[PDB]
Tab-separated table of C-alpha atoms and ligand atoms in Angstrom:
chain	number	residue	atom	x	y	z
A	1	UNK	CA	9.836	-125.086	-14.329
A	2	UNK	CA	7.907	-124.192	-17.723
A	3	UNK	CA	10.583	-125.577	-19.975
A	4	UNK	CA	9.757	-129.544	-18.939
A	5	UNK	CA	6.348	-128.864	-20.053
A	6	UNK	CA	8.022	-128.581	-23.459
A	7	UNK	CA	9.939	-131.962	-23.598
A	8	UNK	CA	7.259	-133.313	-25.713
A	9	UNK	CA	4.766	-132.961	-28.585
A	10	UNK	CA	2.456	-130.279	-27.774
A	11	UNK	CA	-1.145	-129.544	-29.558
A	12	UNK	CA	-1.298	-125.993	-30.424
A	13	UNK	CA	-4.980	-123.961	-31.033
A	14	UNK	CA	-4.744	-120.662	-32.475
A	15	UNK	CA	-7.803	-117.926	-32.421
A	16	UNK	CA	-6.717	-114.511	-34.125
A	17	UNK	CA	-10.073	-111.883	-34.604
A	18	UNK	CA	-9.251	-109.511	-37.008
A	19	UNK	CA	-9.965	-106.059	-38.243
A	20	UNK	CA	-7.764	-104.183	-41.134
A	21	UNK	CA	-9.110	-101.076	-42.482
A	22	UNK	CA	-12.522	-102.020	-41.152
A	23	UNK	CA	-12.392	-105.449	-42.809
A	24	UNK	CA	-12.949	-107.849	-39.948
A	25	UNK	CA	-12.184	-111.393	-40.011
A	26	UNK	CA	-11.064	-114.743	-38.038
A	27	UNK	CA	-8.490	-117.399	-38.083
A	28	UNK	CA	-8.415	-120.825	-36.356
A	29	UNK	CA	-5.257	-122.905	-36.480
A	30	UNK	CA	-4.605	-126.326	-35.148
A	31	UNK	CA	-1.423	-128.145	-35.088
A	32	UNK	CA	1.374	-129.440	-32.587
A	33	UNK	CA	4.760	-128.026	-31.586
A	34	UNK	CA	7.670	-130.099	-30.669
A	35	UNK	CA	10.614	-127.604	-28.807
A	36	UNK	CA	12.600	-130.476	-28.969
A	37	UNK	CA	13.319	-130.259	-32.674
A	38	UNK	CA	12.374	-126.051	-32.691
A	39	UNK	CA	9.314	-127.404	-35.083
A	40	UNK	CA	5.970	-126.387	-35.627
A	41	UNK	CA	3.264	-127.916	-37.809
A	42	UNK	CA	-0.096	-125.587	-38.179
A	43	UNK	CA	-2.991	-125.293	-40.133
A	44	UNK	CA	-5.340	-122.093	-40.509
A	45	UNK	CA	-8.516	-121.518	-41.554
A	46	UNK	CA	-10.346	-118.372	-42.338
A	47	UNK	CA	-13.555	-118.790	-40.582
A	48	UNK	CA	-15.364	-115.883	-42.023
A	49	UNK	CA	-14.517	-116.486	-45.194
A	50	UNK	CA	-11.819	-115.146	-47.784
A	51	UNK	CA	-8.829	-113.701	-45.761
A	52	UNK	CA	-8.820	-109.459	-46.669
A	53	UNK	CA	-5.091	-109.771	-46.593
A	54	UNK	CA	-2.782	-111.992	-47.539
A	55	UNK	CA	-1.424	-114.920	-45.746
A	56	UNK	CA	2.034	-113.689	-45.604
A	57	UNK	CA	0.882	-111.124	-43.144
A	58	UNK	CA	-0.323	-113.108	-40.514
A	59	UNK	CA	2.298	-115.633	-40.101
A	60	UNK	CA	4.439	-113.274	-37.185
A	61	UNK	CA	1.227	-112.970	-35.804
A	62	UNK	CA	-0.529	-116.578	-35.618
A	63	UNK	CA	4.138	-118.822	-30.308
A	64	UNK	CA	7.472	-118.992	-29.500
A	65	UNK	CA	7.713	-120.827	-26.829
A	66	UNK	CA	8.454	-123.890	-29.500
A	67	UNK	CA	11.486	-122.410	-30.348
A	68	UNK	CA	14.928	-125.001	-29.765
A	69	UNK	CA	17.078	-123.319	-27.045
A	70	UNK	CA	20.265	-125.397	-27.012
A	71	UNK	CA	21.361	-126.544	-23.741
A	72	UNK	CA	24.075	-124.086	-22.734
A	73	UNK	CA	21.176	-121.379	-23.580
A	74	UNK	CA	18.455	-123.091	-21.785
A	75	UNK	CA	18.946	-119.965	-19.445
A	76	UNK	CA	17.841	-117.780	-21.925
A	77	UNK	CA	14.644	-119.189	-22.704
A	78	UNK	CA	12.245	-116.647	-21.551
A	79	UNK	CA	9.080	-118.096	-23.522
A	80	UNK	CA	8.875	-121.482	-21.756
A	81	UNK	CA	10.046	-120.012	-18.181
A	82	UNK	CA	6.495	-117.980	-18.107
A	83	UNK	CA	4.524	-121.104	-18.792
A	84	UNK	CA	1.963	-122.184	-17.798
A	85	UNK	CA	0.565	-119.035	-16.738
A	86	UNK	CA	1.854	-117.427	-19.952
A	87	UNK	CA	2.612	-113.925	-21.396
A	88	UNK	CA	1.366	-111.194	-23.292
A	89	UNK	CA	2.891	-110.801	-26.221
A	90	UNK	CA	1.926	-107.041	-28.191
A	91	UNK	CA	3.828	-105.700	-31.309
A	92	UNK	CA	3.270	-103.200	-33.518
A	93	UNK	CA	4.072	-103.801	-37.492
A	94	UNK	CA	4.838	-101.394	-39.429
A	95	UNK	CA	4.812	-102.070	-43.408
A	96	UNK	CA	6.958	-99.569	-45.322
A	97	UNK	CA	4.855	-97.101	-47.940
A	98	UNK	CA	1.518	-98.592	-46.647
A	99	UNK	CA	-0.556	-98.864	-42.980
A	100	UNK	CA	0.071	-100.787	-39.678
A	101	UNK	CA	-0.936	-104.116	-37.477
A	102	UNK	CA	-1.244	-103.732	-33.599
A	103	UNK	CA	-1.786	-107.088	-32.314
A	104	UNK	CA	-2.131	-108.519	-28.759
A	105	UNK	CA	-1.945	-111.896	-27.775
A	106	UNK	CA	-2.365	-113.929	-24.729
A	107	UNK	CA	-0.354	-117.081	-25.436
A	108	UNK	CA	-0.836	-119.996	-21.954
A	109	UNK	CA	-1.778	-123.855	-21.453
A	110	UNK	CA	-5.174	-124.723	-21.361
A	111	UNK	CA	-5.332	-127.996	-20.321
A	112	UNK	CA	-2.151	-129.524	-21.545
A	113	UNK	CA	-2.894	-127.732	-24.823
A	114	UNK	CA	-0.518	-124.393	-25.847
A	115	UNK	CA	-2.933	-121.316	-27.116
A	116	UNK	CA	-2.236	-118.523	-28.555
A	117	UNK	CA	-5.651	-116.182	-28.689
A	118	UNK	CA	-4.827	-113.192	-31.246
A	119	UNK	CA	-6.294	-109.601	-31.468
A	120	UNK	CA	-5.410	-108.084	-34.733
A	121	UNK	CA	-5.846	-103.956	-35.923
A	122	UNK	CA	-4.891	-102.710	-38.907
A	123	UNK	CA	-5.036	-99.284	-39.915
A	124	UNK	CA	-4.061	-96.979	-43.115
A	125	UNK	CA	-3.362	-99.716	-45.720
A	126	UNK	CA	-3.776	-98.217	-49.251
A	127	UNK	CA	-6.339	-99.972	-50.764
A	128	UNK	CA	-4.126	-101.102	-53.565
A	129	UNK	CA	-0.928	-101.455	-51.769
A	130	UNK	CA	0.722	-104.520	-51.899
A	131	UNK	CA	-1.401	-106.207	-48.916
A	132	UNK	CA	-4.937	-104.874	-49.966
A	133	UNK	CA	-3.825	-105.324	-53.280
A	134	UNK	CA	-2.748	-109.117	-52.320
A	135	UNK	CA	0.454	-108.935	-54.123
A	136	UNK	CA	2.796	-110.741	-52.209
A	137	UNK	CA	3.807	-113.903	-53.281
A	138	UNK	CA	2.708	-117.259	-50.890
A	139	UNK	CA	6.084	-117.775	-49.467
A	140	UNK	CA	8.713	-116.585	-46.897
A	141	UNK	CA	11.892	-115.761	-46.198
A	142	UNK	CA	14.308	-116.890	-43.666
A	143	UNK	CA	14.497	-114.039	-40.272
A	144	UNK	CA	16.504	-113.704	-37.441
A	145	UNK	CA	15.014	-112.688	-34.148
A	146	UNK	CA	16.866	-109.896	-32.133
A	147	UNK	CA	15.559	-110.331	-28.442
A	148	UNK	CA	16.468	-108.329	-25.679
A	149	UNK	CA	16.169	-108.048	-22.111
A	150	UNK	CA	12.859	-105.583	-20.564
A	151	UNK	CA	13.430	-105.943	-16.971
A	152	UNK	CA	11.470	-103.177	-16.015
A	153	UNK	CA	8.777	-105.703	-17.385
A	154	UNK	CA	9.849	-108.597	-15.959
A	155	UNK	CA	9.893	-109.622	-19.884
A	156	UNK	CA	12.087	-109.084	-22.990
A	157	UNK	CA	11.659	-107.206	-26.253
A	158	UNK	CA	12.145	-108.032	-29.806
A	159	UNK	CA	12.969	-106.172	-33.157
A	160	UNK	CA	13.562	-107.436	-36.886
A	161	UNK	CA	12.318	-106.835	-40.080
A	162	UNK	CA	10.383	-109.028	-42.282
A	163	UNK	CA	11.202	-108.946	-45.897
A	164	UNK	CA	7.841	-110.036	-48.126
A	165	UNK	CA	8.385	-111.307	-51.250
A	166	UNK	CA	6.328	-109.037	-54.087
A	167	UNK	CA	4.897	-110.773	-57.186
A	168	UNK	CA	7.154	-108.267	-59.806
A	169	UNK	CA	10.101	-109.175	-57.964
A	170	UNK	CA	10.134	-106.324	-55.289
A	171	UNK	CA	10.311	-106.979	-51.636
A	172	UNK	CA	7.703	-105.207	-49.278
A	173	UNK	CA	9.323	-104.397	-45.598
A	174	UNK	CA	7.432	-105.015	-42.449
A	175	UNK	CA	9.493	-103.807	-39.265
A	176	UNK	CA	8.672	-106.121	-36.362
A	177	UNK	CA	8.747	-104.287	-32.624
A	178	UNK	CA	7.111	-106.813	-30.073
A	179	UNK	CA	6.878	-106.747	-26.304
A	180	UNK	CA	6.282	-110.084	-23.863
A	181	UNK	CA	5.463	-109.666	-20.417
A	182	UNK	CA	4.595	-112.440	-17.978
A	183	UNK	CA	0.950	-113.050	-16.797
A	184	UNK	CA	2.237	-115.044	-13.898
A	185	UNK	CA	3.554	-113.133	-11.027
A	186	UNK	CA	6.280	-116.096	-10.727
A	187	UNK	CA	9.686	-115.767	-11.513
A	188	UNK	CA	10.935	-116.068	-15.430
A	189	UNK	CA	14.182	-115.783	-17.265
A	190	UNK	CA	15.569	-112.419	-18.172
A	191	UNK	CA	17.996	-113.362	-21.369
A	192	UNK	CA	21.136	-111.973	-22.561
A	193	UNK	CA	20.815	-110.116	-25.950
A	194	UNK	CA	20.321	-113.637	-28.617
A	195	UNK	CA	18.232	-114.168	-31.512
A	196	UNK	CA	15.914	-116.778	-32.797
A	197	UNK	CA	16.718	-118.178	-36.581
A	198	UNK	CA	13.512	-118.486	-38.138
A	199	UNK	CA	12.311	-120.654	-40.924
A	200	UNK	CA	9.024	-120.777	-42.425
A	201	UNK	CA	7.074	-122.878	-45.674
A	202	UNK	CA	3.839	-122.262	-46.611
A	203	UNK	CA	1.708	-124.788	-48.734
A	204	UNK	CA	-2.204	-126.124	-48.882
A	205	UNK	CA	-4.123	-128.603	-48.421
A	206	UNK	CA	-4.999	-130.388	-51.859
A	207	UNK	CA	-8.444	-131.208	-50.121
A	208	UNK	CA	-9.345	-128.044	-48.733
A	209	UNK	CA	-11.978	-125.724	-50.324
A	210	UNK	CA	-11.932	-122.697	-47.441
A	211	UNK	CA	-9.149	-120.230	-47.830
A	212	UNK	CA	-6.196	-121.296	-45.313
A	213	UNK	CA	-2.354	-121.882	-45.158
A	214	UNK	CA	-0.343	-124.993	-44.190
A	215	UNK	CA	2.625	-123.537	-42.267
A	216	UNK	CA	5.906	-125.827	-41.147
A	217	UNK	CA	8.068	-123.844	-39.079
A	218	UNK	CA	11.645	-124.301	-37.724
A	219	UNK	CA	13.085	-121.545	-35.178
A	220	UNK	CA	16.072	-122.352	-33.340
A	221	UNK	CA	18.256	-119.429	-30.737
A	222	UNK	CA	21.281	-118.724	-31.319
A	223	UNK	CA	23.921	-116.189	-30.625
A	224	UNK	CA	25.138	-116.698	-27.321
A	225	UNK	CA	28.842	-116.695	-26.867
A	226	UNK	CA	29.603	-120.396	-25.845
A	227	UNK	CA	33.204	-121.842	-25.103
A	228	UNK	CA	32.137	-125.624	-26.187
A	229	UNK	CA	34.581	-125.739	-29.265
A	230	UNK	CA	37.370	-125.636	-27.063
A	231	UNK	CA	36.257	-129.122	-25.745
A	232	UNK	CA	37.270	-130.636	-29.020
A	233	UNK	CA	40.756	-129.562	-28.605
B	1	MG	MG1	-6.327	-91.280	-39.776
C-alpha cells in the first residue's frame, strides 16, 4: 500500500523546534526524496538564527521512509508500509562524556508532500564539550542501521552508534536508540532483524548568508539472507 506512494520523486518539509540546555531554536528543511535510488537532497535553515549546536548533531534527527529496500526485501520495509498515516518516530541520544537529545517526531504525507515535524530536548551538555563547544568537524561518517522487530508496538526498533568526527582528530560517540510506532491503526510490516547503510555529505550554499547545511544522503537496507546468487549458476 504505502510503498507505491514512494515510486517517485517526493518533496520533503522538515520543522524541528529545539531546546538544548535551555538554548531554544528552529530548523526548516526543504528538499525531495527519491526511494527509488535510496537518495535524499535537503536543505536547512536555522530560523532563529545561529544554530547552538553544531550541524553534525541534527542530521539523525532532521525520514526514512526514502531509504532503497531491494526487491526481495520489499517485505521488510516498515517505513513506507505506515504511510500515509505515518509513525512516530522517538529516540533518545546519548553522547559519550557530555549530555543527551530526546527527540519526537511525527513523520506523514500532507498533501502529496512527506513531513517530518521534529521536537528536540537536550539536557546536561558541558558547556565546553565538544557540541557546546562546536568542535566537531562539518562532515560525517558512513553508519549502519540495526533495526529490529517491536511487535508489541506494532513497530520496530533501532540501535547504532554515530561516530562524530572531532577537530584534533578525536571522534565523539553518540549512541542512537530510536522507537517507530504506527499512527495508523492499519496494518504495517513487521521486519526481520536488517540494517540500513547510511551515507551522508554535508556542504553550503555559496549564496546563503543564514546559518544552514546542504545534506545529500544515500541509505540503502541490507542484510537479509537472499538465495539470488545461486541464479547465476
Ligand atoms: Mg540535573
Amino acid at each position: 500500500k504505502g510503498e507505491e506512494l514512494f515510486t517517485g520523486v517526493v518533496p520533503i518539509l522538515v520543522e524541528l523546534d529545539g531546546d538544548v540546555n535551555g538554548h531554544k531554536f528552529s530548523v526548516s528543511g526543504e528538499g525531495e526524496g527519491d526511494a527509488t535510488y535510496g537518495k535524499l537532497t535537503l536543505k536547512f535553515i536555522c530560523t532563529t538564527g545561529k544554530l547552538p549546536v553544531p550541524w553534525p548533531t541534527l542530521v539523525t534527527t532532521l525520514v526514512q521512509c526514502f531509504s532503497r529496500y531491494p526487491d526481495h526485501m520489499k517485505q521488510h520495509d516498515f517505513f513506507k508500509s505506515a504511510m500515509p498515516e505515518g509513525y512516530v518516530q522517538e529516540r533518545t541520544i546519548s553522547f559519550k562524556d557530555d549530555g543527551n537529545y530526546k527527540t519526537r517526531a511525527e513523520v506523514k504525507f500532507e498533501g502529496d508532500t512527506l513531513v517530518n515535524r521534529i521536537e528536540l530536548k537536550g539536557i546536561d551538555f558541558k558547556e565546553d564539550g565538544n557540541i557546546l563547544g562546536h568542535k566537531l568537524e562539518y562532515n560525517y561518517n558512513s553508519h549502519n542501521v540495526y533495526i529490529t522487530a517491536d511487535k508489541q508496538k506494532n513497530g520496530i526498533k533501532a540501535n547504532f552508534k554515530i561516530r562524530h568526527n572531532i577537530e584534533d582528530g578525536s571522534v565523539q560517540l553518540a549512541d542512537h536508540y530510536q522507537q517507530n510506532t504506527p499512527i495508523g491503526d492499519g496494518p504495517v510490516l513487521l521486519p526481520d532483524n536488517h540494517y540500513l547503510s547510511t551515507q551522508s555529505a554535508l556542504s553550503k550554499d555559496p549564496n546563503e548568508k543564514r546559518d544552514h547545511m546542504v545534506l545529500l544522503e544515500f541509505v540503502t537496507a541490507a542484510g537479509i539472507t537472499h538465495g539470488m546468487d545461486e541464479l547465476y549458476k
